[PDB]
Structure 1
Amino acid sequence: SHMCDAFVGTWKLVSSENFDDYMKEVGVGFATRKVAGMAKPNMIISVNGDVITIKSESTFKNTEISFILGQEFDEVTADDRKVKSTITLDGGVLVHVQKWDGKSTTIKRKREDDKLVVECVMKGVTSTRVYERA
């Protein structure tokens, strides 16, 4: 079906802006913010039929989620939140909403030129993380 063809691949983080404030807003403690903020993850995105898998490999944590668009799932985040996640495709953007403890954060993943841009939003705080092909 070629859904998400442009996202598929191996991507390496090259820049991050305002991620400390994002993590604070989400509730991440001091030490975890410091160590997570250093990391330069490899994000590996693959598709097999209707199932999308996004793996993140880094010095901090390795994470993996597999999901079907529109179908809620359980996720344990890198900072150990136990969240309920739903990922949809809206106008070519992967939109990932995480719900936990009456809170919500949204992570958007977009293809821009040869980059994959990740925008993380919690209340009024945004962080932008830019990935290039690995």
Structure 2
Amino acid sequence: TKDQNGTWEMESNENFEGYMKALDIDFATRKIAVRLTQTKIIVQDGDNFKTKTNSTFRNYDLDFTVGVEFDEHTKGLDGRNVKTLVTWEGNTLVCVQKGEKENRGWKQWVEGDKLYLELTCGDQVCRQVFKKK
């Protein structure tokens, strides 16, 4: 369990193109997406999270309560319907997205004033680091 509240500015993004490719996102959207800075805003009131991942092209907003399974519609990404559950494994927030894609989900944790995010889909891992502003 840990405080992840804040505005976080991207400082690193490794193999985002491989992750988008495992999601079958098209060539044109990917080439534009891989070059953009992302900012993440997170408001955390206990077990309720409101998140926004912004970039000039397109944004992605995801709200959820820890430990309550829900239906996520990945609109603006691959636009699939997945069954999502986010839980705490120590101070990593762990998300599994059950559906057609194998091994799909993410892990998010803080160290110092950096937010680390690991995104998985199939055999592809994408590593991102953001710094709190």
Distance 1:107 1:68 in 2: 16
Equivalent residue runs for 1:18-57 within 5 Å: 18-57=15-54
Are residue 81 (structure 1) and residue 84 (structure 2) matched? no
| Residue range with higher mean Cα deviation, 10-19 or 79-88 | 79-88
**1:99-119 Cα shifts (integer Å, max 9, x gaps):** 233544121111123210111
CA contact (8 A) 2:91 2:109 kept: yes
Q: TM-score, normalised by structure 1?
A: 0.86
Give 1 or 2: higher helix fraction: 1
The alpha-carbon deviation at position 71 of structure 1 amounts to 0.9
| Matched residues, number | 131
Identical pairs, percent:
38
Q: The residue matched to 2:28 in structure 1 has which SS?
A: helix
List runs of 5+ in structure 2 lacking aligned partners: none
Distance 1:50 1:113 in 2: 21
Q: Which amino acid aligns with 2:33?
A: A
**1:51-107 Cα shifts (integer Å, max 9, x gaps):** 111111211222211111111122233412332211111110011112233544121
Q: TM-score, normalised by structure 2?
A: 0.87
Deviation >3 Å, runs of 4+ = none
CA contact (8 A) 1:115 1:133 kept: yes
List runs of 5+ in structure 1 lacking aligned partners: none
